[PDB]
């Protein structure tokens, strides 16, 4: 039968604190009806302002990705929809009770932990996926993100980062059969100290700690525990592409090759391909059995 839209079964609530600005945030994460979408709802305000998670309202890309409406802002909404994409999660309200999403532990982790606590509800609509027929490329210098024709999902990312730590970082995950909780999940943001003063003074990382964040200096990790994964930079840039690749608003079907990109080149990279309507095309699967990509039982 048909592959079915999802949302949320029950609500789930959550506190913590903004990675950037280092404010106290209250999340509520609601059910929303067929071809919602996922939404972004700045609770705290009255009226409540609602941002859908969409390219076009995508505002600055400096060190996070950051949602825009008149001058009302959902900073750092890419370690969520990450979480999101890689649950199959269609439709959701997202209440914030600040302008930045919880940075949690750094990773995806908590959030999937919490949805899949709270279960999913398939919907009785057909998942609208976006399957990719050309390439689409962009570039700014040396750093390039790429989209290609692939019969599935696939993310591959390489980092060319001088820095003792990495002793080139290079992954490809396909989760047409790899799964994002097990291998991408659970990858920590990072920072390095040489630039946190820098950072603090533009009022950036103001909640950073080790207890969110991978923190380097200049030859080692100083978090005590260490890491998750012998490659947790590389995965979190790949944890990092798929929520920013979630803004499309439906998951994709094709393959995501990033070279020292990030979340600038990332939005570049979707309002090109949505720009060019030769390069992609909606598509739904009445047969889960011939589809390209599954999901995990909600
Ligand atoms: C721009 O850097 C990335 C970004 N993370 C951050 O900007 C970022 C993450 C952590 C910190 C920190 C810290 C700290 C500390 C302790 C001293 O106060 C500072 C910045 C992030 O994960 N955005 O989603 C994208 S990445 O290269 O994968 C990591
Ligand atoms: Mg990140």
């Given at each position: 039968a048909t592959i079915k839209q999802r949302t949320l079964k029950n609500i789930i609530r959550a506190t913590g604190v903004g990675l950037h600005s280092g404010e106290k945030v209250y999340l509520t994460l609601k059910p929303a009806p067929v071809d919602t979408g996922i939404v972004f709802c700045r609770t705290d305000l009255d009226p409540v302002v609602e941002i859908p998670a969409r390219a076009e309202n995508v505002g600055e890309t400096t060190m996070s990705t950051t949602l825009v409406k008149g001058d009302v802002k959902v900073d750092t909404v890419e370690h969520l929809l990450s979480a999101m994409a890689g649950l199959g999660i269609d439709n959701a309200y997202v209440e914030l009770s600040a302008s930045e999403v919880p940075i949690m532990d750094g990773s995806a982790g908590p959030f999937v932990f919490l949805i899949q606590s709270a279960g999913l509800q398939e919907q009785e609509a057909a998942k609208k996926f976006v399957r990719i027929k050309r390439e689409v490329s962009v570039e700014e210098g040396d750093k390039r993100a790429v989209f290609v024709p692939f019969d599935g999902f696939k993310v591959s990312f390489e980092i060319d980062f001088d820095h003792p730590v990495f002793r080139t970082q290079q992954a490809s995950v396909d989760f047409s059969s790899t799964?994002?909780?097990?291998?991408?999940?659970?990858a920590r943001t990072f920072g390095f100290m040489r630039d946190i003063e820098y950072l603090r003074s533009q009022n950036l990382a103001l909640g950073g700690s080790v207890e969110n964040a991978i923190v380097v200096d200049e030859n080692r990790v100083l978090n005590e525990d260490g890491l998750r994964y012998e490659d947790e930079f590389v995965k979190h840039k790949i944890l990092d592409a798929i929520g920013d690749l979630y803004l499309l608003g439906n998951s994709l079907i094709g393959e995501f090759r990033g070279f020292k990109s990030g979340h600038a080149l990332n939005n570049q990279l979707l309002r090109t391909l949505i720009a060019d309507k030769d390069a992609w095309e909606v598509v739904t699967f009445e047969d889960a059995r011939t589809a390209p990509i599954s999901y995990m039982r909600p």
């Open positions: 799964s994002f909780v097990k291998e991408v999940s659970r």
